[PDB]
Amino acid sequence: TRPANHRQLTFEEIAKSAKITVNEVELLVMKALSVGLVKGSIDEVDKRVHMTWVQPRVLDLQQIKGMKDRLEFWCTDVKSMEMLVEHQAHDILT
Amino acid sequence: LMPYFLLTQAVRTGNLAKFNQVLDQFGEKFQADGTYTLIIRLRHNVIKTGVRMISLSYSRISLADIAQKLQLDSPEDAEFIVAKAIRDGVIEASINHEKGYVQSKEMIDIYSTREPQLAFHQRISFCLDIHNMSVKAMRFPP
Amino acid sequence: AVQKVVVHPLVLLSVVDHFNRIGKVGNQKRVVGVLLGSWQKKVLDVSNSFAVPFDEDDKDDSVWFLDHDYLENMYGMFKKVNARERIVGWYHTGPKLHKNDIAINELMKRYCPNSVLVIIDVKPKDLGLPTEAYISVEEVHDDGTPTSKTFEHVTSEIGAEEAEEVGVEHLLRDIKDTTVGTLSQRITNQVHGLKGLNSKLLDIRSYLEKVATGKLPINHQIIYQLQDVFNLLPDVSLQEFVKAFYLKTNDQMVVVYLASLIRSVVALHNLINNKIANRDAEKKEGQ
Amino acid sequence: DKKFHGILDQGEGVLIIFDEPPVDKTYEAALETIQNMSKVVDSLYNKAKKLT
Amino acid sequence: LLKLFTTMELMRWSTLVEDYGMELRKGSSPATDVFGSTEEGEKRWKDLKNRVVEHNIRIMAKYYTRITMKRMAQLLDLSVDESEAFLSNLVVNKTIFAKVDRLAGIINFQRPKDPNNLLNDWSQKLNSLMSLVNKTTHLIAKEEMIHNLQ
Amino acid sequence: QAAELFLDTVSTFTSYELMDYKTFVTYTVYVSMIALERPDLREKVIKGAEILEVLHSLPAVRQYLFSLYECRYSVFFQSLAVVEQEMKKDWLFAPHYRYYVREMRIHAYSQLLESYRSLTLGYMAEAFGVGVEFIDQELSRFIAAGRLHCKIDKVNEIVETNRPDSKNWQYQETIKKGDLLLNRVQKLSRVINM
Amino acid sequence: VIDAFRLINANMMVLGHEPRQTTSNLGHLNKPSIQALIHGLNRHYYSITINYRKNELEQKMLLNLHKKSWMEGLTLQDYSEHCKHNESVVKEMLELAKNYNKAVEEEDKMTQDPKRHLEEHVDVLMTSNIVQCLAAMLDTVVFK
């Protein structure tokens, strides 16, 4: 669920999630990484976990509508940057 | 420039007496050139020069210390002077009168930012313009 | 299985010519032929092809007359001409598949176990290659869904023999681009890259629209790949990345600045020489 | 004396030992080329300002 | 025991002792002389402790970026000073990369991040993303072309 | 240049009509200390055979030079004060004693701060054998003049060390040299284009 | 190197008449090969002009051969390799700057390769650096 912008999960977040105090979220994340569910690292000095992957699974129609919305945004950004570059460099495009 | 050399010496020393005696001695040349309004705005920026040197060679100096070093009357007056210097952006720092000390901006490593890009952009555009001007001025007379 | 298929300019031209001649003599949506090539690991090399007589009832959608006897006769004569080219698949010049494609691939699998369809679109696009490759795989879906004998996409590429590269280059000599990166062409290539990325994102968004509304079913491999893509999107607002980015941009800009300074000095030297030459010429003319 | 890449700190009372990034050779070459082009411009001064 | 030493996770030495002590050291199914009770038994016990700590340190260096000493001590079953000495010995031997910020105890396995490397990782991410979106659009074209046919 | 010439001619001093070898060696030591970096100083003065031979006879010049080299700074200021007096009395160096003392003080301060990121004023004063007001005033003066890379912090007396990184220094040098060259190019272009 | 031919009847050549009529300027503008001459180009046969019928669709299909992918259009050069190349070319350009300084000085005191090579190096540096800078900008915008 967390987007790549702020995929820095926190020990307190994982505590408010599946019920465990913050002294074994470390072990839980270790188990996840070892099994291969997720990838990344755990900065326990700052008490947060960096996730750079997730094992994909099967989704719901609403979970795909969310992906559709995210695409809509991405397409809009790409089109805007395309128009900007094309207009700016119009006089040198071959 | 000798009269202005004396003027610069007096301001750098920060002594109103030497500043005034220089002014009285060389008023004539100052009529001839025309600076009097500037030469009193000078006194203003003479106290400003004192505060700017202080902020140039310090990072967390206290208000009492600033006042003592500038020979100001009170830390209150020093606080006013430094705050106005901040406003004018001649020292470009901060201030904090909870503990009565003027903090300076946390100097940042100015190469991982857009200032080098902006400077090189100005210089690159200038060089491109010079090349274009030269290749345009190139002439073939027949 | 086959991981890659590389089609050749000769195959593309032969397919285009076949379609043109068939559509000139008559009218048909598709034209069908056999693709001859060789294997090198799981990398098929479709180096030749030949058309086969074929017509179908576009209404019934299940009656067609691919000519096996013609296929085998042509394959034998092509074997006689060249031997290292065995039947490796077939092609049809239809932009879209049909219910007959699975049946015709079943027919072709008698001549090749790993028979591969290659749809070669005669209509010329502008973003992707004109060839789409398909391999018929029928396996119990680990998904747990009913399994039907259907196609699966195969990575496709365009490659050329040297004796075909010479001909291609000669034919394109008039409209060829420079085989070097000139700044204008590099900027144009970046713009075309943005165009292609936008088109692909639009296609994915349209498919997501259709699957979400309900027209199409949820393809689990598609959804897995999209999930992985969104996992793979970078984070560009990270401070540790912004700092490195500014550092590298400044390094590149200082190199550019030095280059432009040198270029301006050289141009000034050239103009100094020109002014001196003009002075000399006018003095000589005057005297 | 530059025996190791570290700097003391008389505050917290510490020795920060680090790895000094290599001296960028592109800037060294750029500065040398800058001075070379400066003397080239001096030569161009000698040429033009004296012959025109 | 072999399964634990092959797993890529932290096996606590205290728990390993509680579970596998009697059956490796006091025997039942005899007790192998290795891990006995005499000089070369106790020494090999300490050697096994060292192997457990080495395994734990490797797992940390593989699944951490900044682990506090306060935490390594407890999770490794050594006092703060003992853990620091063990890690320093490993670092000198060049088996484990780790820099200990002893002032704050911020033991860090992060190798210094060159801007070249950071932007290279970014570019590789982008390259793989474009390749994956291309593959996804190919499969999407196939899926639409097939099911829309029905 | 005086250091260069004196060190090149130290081993073969023949001009006894100007000054005796001892005076010449004192001049070489002084000029070398004020002109040479630490590595060259160690290679050519501290490890100089013909200079050490005479510095055995001269016990004060040796104390000056080695107090600087071995980072003994209280003794260094003592030796610098005696050098200032001697070299005010001298006739050839007479219009240089203020400048030389100032430059040697700056060299000592830069040398102390060269191996520190944050040096407390108390420690600096104890090292130099002076008070805290003295060090504060001197450091403020030289930082204002731009001769030291350090910023004072008086509320909690600490001398932070703002030395510029290698890349930052390279960027600043590029800006300066490019500004000079670009001014020259602009002047030439405007002279010639018309 | 392809060439068409047809034979000249043995009677026509001896009859003094030219092997082939010449009613237009088309057909000429082709330089016959020395090998063909020495093997009797015009004495037994004659070279016909070869033209090629190129359709627009065929040309586009041919272009598909080496047509670049939008990936390669939008991709970035390895940054370590880019830095190495910039450093190498800048050092080479430094050497050429020294050479060009000496060349200008000597020529203007007694009154080219250095200038030309320096121009080529500056051109390659500018194009490569600008292309990668713009590609990085586009990536940062487009991919978020």
UniProtKB/Swiss-Prot annotation, chain A:
Q: Which residues carry this modification: N6-acetyllysine?
A: K16
Superkingdom of origin organism: Eukaryota
What is its biological role?
Component of the 26S proteasome, a multiprotein complex involved in the ATP-dependent degradation of ubiquitinated proteins. This complex plays a key role in the maintenance of protein homeostasis by removing misfolded or damaged proteins, which could impair cellular functions, and by removing proteins whose functions are no longer required. Therefore, the proteasome participates in numerous cellular processes, including cell cycle progression, apoptosis, or DNA damage repair.
State the family it belongs to.
Answer: Belongs to the proteasome subunit S11 family.
Subunit-level organization: Component of the 19S proteasome regulatory particle complex. The 26S proteasome consists of a 20S core particle (CP) and two 19S regulatory subunits (RP). The regulatory particle is made of a lid composed of 9 subunits including PSMD13, a base containing 6 ATPases and few additional components.
Return the protein name.
26S proteasome non-ATPase regulatory subunit 13
Species this chain originates from: Homo sapiens
Taxonomic placement:
Eukaryota, Metazoa, Chordata, Craniata, Vertebrata
Gene name in the database record: PSMD13
What fragment of the whole protein does this chain represent? Answer: 283 to 376 of 376
Swiss-Prot record, chain C:
Q: Which UniProt keywords apply?
A: Acetylation, Isopeptide bond, Proteasome, Ubl conjugation
Positions of disulphide bridges: none
Q: List, alphabetically, the InterPro entries matched.
A: EIF3F/CSN6-like_C, JAMM/MPN+_dom, MPN, MPN_RPN7_8
Listed GO molecular functions? protein homodimerization activity
In this UniProt entry, the residues modified to N6-acetyllysine are K200, K210
Top-level division of the source organism's lineage: Eukaryota
Looking up CDD domains in the UniProt record yields:
MPN_RPN7_8
Keyword check for Aminoacyl-tRNA synthetase: no
Keyword Acetylation present in the record's keywords: the answer is yes
What are the BP-aspect GO terms? proteasome-mediated ubiquitin-dependent protein catabolic process
Q: Which GO terms describe its cellular component?
A: cytosol; extracellular exosome; extracellular region; ficolin-1-rich granule lumen; membrane; nucleoplasm; nucleus; proteasome complex
Any Pfam family hit: MitMem_reg
Give residues for the crosslink Glycyl lysine isopeptide (Lys-Gly) (interchain with G-Cter in ubiquitin).
K176
Show where the MPN domain sits.
5-140
Complexes and interactors? Component of the 19S proteasome regulatory particle complex. The 26S proteasome consists of a 20S core particle (CP) and two 19S regulatory subunits (RP). The regulatory particle is made of a lid composed of 9 subunits including PSMD7, a base containing 6 ATPases and few additional components. Within the complex, PSMD7 interacts with subunit PSMD4 through their respective MPN domain. Interacts with TRIM5.
Q: What family is it from?
A: Belongs to the peptidase M67A family.
The extra comment attached to this record reads: Does not bind a metal ion.
User: What name goes with this protein?
Assistant: 26S proteasome non-ATPase regulatory subunit 7
Tell me the name of the encoding gene: PSMD7
Curated annotation (Swiss-Prot), chain D:
The known PTMs are summarized as: Phosphorylated by AMPK.
Its annotated compartments are: Nucleus; Cytoplasm, Cytosol
What upregulates it? By FOXO4; expression in embryonic stem cells (ESCs) is mediated by FOXO4.
In terms of domain of life, where is this protein from? Eukaryota
Expressing tissues: Highly expressed in embryonic stem cells (ESCs). Expression decreases as ESCs differentiate.
Spell out the family assignment given in the record's similarity comment: Belongs to the proteasome subunit S9 family.
Binding partners and assembly: Component of the 19S proteasome regulatory particle complex. The 26S proteasome consists of a 20S core particle (CP) and two 19S regulatory subunits (RP). The regulatory particle is made of a lid composed of 9 subunits including PSMD11, a base containing 6 ATPases and few additional components.
| Job description of the protein | Component of the 26S proteasome, a multiprotein complex involved in the ATP-dependent degradation of ubiquitinated proteins. This complex plays a key role in the maintenance of protein homeostasis by removing misfolded or damaged proteins, which could impair cellular functions, and by removing proteins whose functions are no longer required. Therefore, the proteasome participates in numerous cellular processes, including cell cycle progression, apoptosis, or DNA damage repair. In the complex, PSMD11 is required for proteasome assembly.
Output this protein's name: 26S proteasome non-ATPase regulatory subunit 11
Name the species this protein comes from: Homo sapiens
Curated annotation (Swiss-Prot), chain F:
Please list the residue ranges annotated as the PCI domain. 1-166
Complex formation: Component of the 19S proteasome regulatory particle complex. The 26S proteasome consists of a 20S core particle (CP) and two 19S regulatory subunits (RP). The regulatory particle is made of a lid composed of 9 subunits including PSMD6, a base containing 6 ATPases and few additional components.
The protein's job, in short, is: Component of the 26S proteasome, a multiprotein complex involved in the ATP-dependent degradation of ubiquitinated proteins. This complex plays a key role in the maintenance of protein homeostasis by removing misfolded or damaged proteins, which could impair cellular functions, and by removing proteins whose functions are no longer required. Therefore, the proteasome participates in numerous cellular processes, including cell cycle progression, apoptosis, or DNA damage repair.
User: Which family, according to the similarity comment?
Assistant: Belongs to the proteasome subunit S10 family.
Query: What is the designated name of this protein?
Result: 26S proteasome non-ATPase regulatory subunit 6
Provide the species name.
Answer: Homo sapiens
Lineage summary:
Eukaryota, Metazoa, Chordata, Craniata, Vertebrata
Stretch of the intact protein here: 196 to 389 of 389
